[PDB]
Structure formats: C-alpha cells, structure tokens
Write a protein that binds this ligand. Structure first.
Ligand SMILES: Nc1ncnc2c1ncn2[C@@H]1O[C@H](COP(=O)(O)OP(=O)(O)OP(O)(O)=S)[C@@H](O)[C@H]1O
Lengths: 190, 190, 191, 190
C-alpha cells in the first residue's frame, strides 16, 4: 500500500500517490533488482519530465543492490540523451549497475549521503553449455565490460588500467572515499 | 464640483435635476448660515455641506477635508490597532493612490487580498477604516456560498426561478451604498 | 483491509486510508522487517512532508523486529538530512535497525513506551565463495559495525568501548533502563 | 469481499465499508492472530478516534486466537495513554494478548459475551544458537513473563502469586467465571 497525498491546486485538492506527487516535483526513486519492466518504467518517467520542463534537473535516487546489466543500459542511454542533468543521489547501497547508474549522472549534480556505501565489481553472466556457443557469449560480456569501463572512465576520469585492475575483484568504497576516487563529485549533508 | 460630486455620490437621482438641487440648496444655506459675515459668494465649501446632508453620509463628500485625514490616516488607525504595522502602510498608500484621481475608470478604487492567520485583526482594520473614511460597511461570509446553487444569492437568481424577486444581496447592498467597503470573509472557501 | 476515514475539510469531505490521514499530520508508520521496498515509502513520506512544512516536526513509529543494514541506513541519513526534527517513538518492539533509527531522533523529541523492548545486537552477515572474496567481504562487515558503534555513541553519548562490549553479543534493554543508557527518553504520561 | 453500506447524511449520500462505517462510531475489530502489521493498523484507528473526540469512549471487540506478544504490547500501551475509555468486548474466543488487552480496558466498561471463552497461558518462546545467546534470550522471556503477571494482576485485581500459578498452565475460563476472576466487570445484558 502507498499513502495517498492530496496536492493542493487552484481548482481544488486532488488525491495522488506518494510516488506520484514526488514525480510532480521532479523526484524519481529507484529500488529493487533492476528489471526490464522496472527499467522501462523509470524511462517513461524521465521522458515525461523532460517534456514538462526541459531545463529543471530530474532527481534520481538509487537504492538498489544491482540487477541485469542489459536492463541497466536502457536507463543509461535514456539519461544521457535527455537535456536536463540527472541528480543521482545515492541514498544507500549501489552495486555494479548501481555505481554505473550514478556515475552516468551529470558532473556537478551527483551527491552522496554520509553513510552510503557504493560496491563496485565486474559483471557476471556465467553460462554453461557447448564450448562453441560459449565463445560468443564469452566475447560479449567482455565487450560490455569494456564499453561500460570506457564510459565509466569518461565520467570519472580515472585511468582505464587502474579501473580494470580494481574492478577485477569486489571493491567496497565509503562515501568519503568515493569522492576521492571520483565516483561522486560532492557530498550532500545539509 | 456640484455636478461631479452628485454623480459620484447621489446615484439615485439623475444629473439634470439633482445638480440644480445642490445649487438651489447651497444658495439657501449660503444665505442662512452667515451671521454678520456677509459671505455673499458661494464657495466650494457650501457645496460639500449640502451634498453630504442630502446624500446621508458622515461628511465623506468634502474637498480638502479628506487630505487632513489622508495625511495621518495610518497614525489614527495605529491607535485602534496594535501590530501588523507593515500592512497599514500597504493599505493606506493604495487608498491614497486611488483617491488621488490617478486610478482606472473601469476598475474599483482598489482590490486587496488581506492574508494573515486568523485573529490578527484584518476585520478590525476594515471596521475602523470605514468609520475613518466615513463609508458604510458590507460584511459577507463565503462559508454559506460554497454550494453551486448558493452562488446565485450574490448576483440574484435568473428570471423564472426561485429567488428572483428579492434579488441579490451583493448587488442590492452595492446599489444602496456604492461607497461602502466590501468585506468577504474566507474567500478561499468560495 | 485498510479502513477509510472521512476528513471534514474546508469546502468538501474526502475519504482517505487510515495510514494516509496520519501522514497528513506527519505521522509515519514503520512496521515489519526493513527492506529496500518499505524504506522508499518512509523516505518518500519524509521528503514529501518536508516540502509541505519544514517547520513542523515529523514523527516516526518503530515496530520492526530487524531488517537489512543497507536499507536501514537510508532512513538514518534521510532523517538527519531533513530539517524537521524526527521524533522516534517505539511501539511493541525494537531491533538492531529499530534501535539504530530509534536513537537518531532529535534529542528530547525521542520517546519510548513503558512496555517497549529494545534489542541491540551487532550486524550479522554471511558470505560464501572463494577464500580471497570472503576476506574482502569480511573487512566490509567489520567496517559497517565500526560505523554503527560510532554513530550510536554520538546520540547515546556512551563511550565506544562500553557499547562495543554490549553490542558484541545479543543485548536487551527495558524501557526504563533504555533512558539511563540514552537510547530514548521517558514518555510524558500526561493526559 | 467487504459489503458497502450507505449513510443517511443531510449533505448527500456517503458510501462506506462495513468496517469503515463502524469505525466512524468508535468501534475497532481486533480479529485474527496478533501481528505487527495488523496491530499497527489498530493503533492508527485508536489515535484517529482520540483526536476526533477524546471525551467519547472507543469500543474494541477482541475475537482473536492470540499471537506475537511483542505486537500486542503496542495495543496495550496506546490504550492506557489515550484518554478515551477503551471498552473491551470479547466475542467468541480469547487467548494470549487477547485476554491481556481485554483486562487492559478501562474499568467499568469491560464485558464478555455469555458464550465467550477466555484462555490465558504463559508466553511460549524458543531460541536456538550458541549457549551464550540462549542465556540472554532466555532471561528476556522471564522479564516479559513477569511483566504480564504484574500488569494482569493490576487490572484483574488478583494477587501476584495466584496469577503465576494459574498462568503456569493453560487455563480456560468461561464468561461467568471471568466475572468472578476479575478479567471483566460483568457480562453483556440485552
Ligand atoms: N491587532 C488588534 N488590535 C486591536 N484589536 C484587535 C486586534 N486583533 C484582534 N482584535 C480584537 O479582537 C476582535 C476579534 O477578532 P476578529 O475581528 O473577529 O478577527 P478576524 O477578523 O476573524 O481575524 P483575521 O485574522 O483578520 S481572519 C476584533 O474585532 C478586535 O476587537
């Protein structure tokens, strides 16, 4: 159940869901494992907000533990295309795709909470079967990692060699240390 | 002054006869009031007296007398109201602005939307402004005009429907006192 | 099975759920194990309420038996970031996240009920796999525990050493005992 | 499905649910096993009614087979804190936290149906783990057990020792016996 909040208007009060009223204020929330339906839902919200206002920033709260990589790419390609800068405020955990989504955020508007934690590791698409088919599948995952790492380094600016070395094994970064690494430009506290 | 004042205040009667009435009365009063003064000339002062008396108003229609009250309207008002001093400046200036003859002919003297928490004393400012400016007071409550069929009580019901004969309280009160101050409590509920 | 209540507001009468009406008065309800999904509702309510009236103080009931550390922290950071003072009343039960969020309320505004039971234990996490991966994961759980004790010390005011001794093992604190510890304040009990 | 009932109001006909209609008359239904979510819902209904009219008395009907002791304590604390006298009508059955909340109701207004059957037993909680953990959890069950006896003895009025011996083993009390025991003041009369 979602609480219904009335939004005062000159015509009169109209009841709306808590998420609905937040969307009216350019606030979009993200949570749960990334899914095609979930990714497409956040995509429709981004497009509607851009048409409503093409300048005001659209907030994007990421509190997800990671999900399918392919689903996440749709969100990333929709965020870059839209003219308004996305404010990727990380309010909690941020797995591989979680880190990728917040890093895609426009520079100068990315914020992080004091006690948030961003976990970055490599993608895992392990499949078992005939060696012939695995070759193409094996080639594909590296290409996504290379493409993601290339785009990731473009946003952050760190050396590609260092990023792959670190991303080979699971890495945990604190909110203070995250800004040092360049994941988030600033921290929001007050 | 006599013709202009009669149209401005004596709305019940037409201009040709009412204007002569003021001139005729001023001659009789200009002759009776002097006691050894021998003030044969009929100045603007005599016109103000007769128009006021025949208009049934408390000395409102006088020239050069209002300027004395306008000079210290806020001062004499501040002695009957304590607090919201900034509001007095906005209200008193707009009143003087309208009275200076610079306002618009197809608009009221001034439309204001007093906004403050209940009990501050907006009604007290109005009940004292009317006594100061020598005008009547019209008080209505929009709490009883929140329905769809109750709106006709202000302007009157249309012909052939209930409520037509007595008419509308708003238009009737305005015609009875075209110089009164219109007060509408809780306009937002309307 | 959520009852409906009629609000005799100006110009009309509108029906809202029992939970929704209380949200109008800045009374958020936290119930059940904390998770990424339920946390968004509390965070959404806090942000929505701030826009409506930053001056007014938000309220927060806690009836949770535990939850996820990651999702719990989001409520803690959001609570502190919002200007409004967030009261922290505990109804029925408290836990690691219930007690961590209970002590984060503005000092003085936080309160506790007479029969409330507060449970404060260290974060528990389990990971399996390659030995090297567990070592990296092992460091993370230790750091999370360190971040919890220091933040708890700031509100409660107790030394880090004292809380660590109690936190290392399962602990339970009665409502009167909790006041001395500093987790909460006693209820007004005035009618 | 829940049937819908119509209320005869002068303004207009108002739709209502069977539960919501009775909620408008300060009637709460504590149906089903005691649970965190269901208990929290009852807490909100009590506060809502208290704000509407603290002078009036809030009615509570307890027909439940028992449940989580911790969740039930929430109902007990709010009930005393709220000024409205929380009447307690036990319909059909009562169990752990059913009888405790039944006795917790304001004195002079507690009642039991003629065929209602009460049941009171010691809390049954078990913990598994290391020996050190069982020692802390076991002690907590001793504290709450004693806390229920003390509060049950207060409302019931029986001696502390009598409650411990009776509660040690499950006891089923008929509605006439309940009046003698002290859990309720009297049985409902037509
Ligand atoms: N600032 C004030 N100075 C002097 N008397 C005041 C003041 N405020 C209120 N009063 C007195 O209190 C009386 C009752 O207040 P009301 O006039 O009924 O208030 P109100 O008009 O409903 O309030 P708002 O804020 O204007 S909607 C007034 O008529 C005055 O006699």
């Amino acid at each position: 159940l979602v609480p219904m909040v009335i939004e005062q208007t000159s015509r009169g009060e109209r009841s709306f869901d808590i998420y609905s009223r937040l969307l009216k204020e350019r606030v979009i929330f993200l949570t749960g494992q990334v899914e095609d339906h979930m990714a497409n839902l956040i995509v429709a919200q981004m497009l509607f907000l851009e048409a409503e206002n093409p300048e005001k920033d659209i907030y994007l709260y990421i509190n997800s533990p990671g999900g399918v990589i392919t689903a996440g790419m749709s969100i990333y390609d929709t965020m870059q295309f839209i003219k308004p800068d996305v404010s990727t405020i990380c309010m909690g955990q941020a797995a591989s795709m979680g880190a990728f989504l917040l890093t895609a955020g426009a520079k100068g508007k990315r914020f992080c909470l004091p006690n948030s934690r961003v976990m970055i590791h490599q993608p895992l698409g392990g499949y078992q079967g005939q060696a012939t088919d695995i070759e193409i599948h094996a080639r594909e995952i590296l290409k996504v990692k290379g493409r993601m790492n290339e785009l990731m380094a473009l946003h952050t600016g760190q050396s590609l060699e260092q990023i792959e070395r670190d991303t080979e094994r699971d890495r945990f970064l604190s909110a203070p240390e995250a800004v040092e690494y360049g994941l988030v430009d600033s921290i929001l506290t007050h | 002054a006599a013709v202009e004042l009669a149209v401005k205040y004596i709305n019940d009667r037409h201009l040709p006869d009412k204007a002569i009435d003021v001139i005729d009365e001023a001659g009789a009063r200009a002759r009776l009031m002097p006691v050894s003064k021998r003030k044969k000339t009929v100045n603007v002062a005599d016109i103000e007296s007769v128009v006021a008396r025949i208009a049934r108003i408390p000395e409102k229609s006088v020239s050069q007398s209002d300027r004395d009250t306008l000079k210290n309207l806020g001062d004499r008002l501040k002695m009957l109201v304590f607090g919201q001093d900034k509001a007095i400046e906005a209200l008193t200036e707009a009143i003087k602005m309208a009275r200076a003859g610079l306002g618009h002919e197809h608009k009221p003297v001034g439309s204001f939307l007093f906004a403050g928490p209940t009990g501050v004393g907006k009604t007290e400012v109005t009940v004292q402004l009317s006594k100061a400016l020598g005008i009547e007071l019209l008080r209505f409550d929009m709490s009883e005009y929140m329905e769809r069929h109750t709106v006709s009580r202000l302007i009157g019901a249309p012909p052939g429907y209930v409520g037509f004969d007595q008419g509308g309280l708003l238009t009737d009160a305005v015609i009875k006192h075209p110089h009164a101050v219109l007060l509408l409590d809780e306009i937002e509920k309307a």
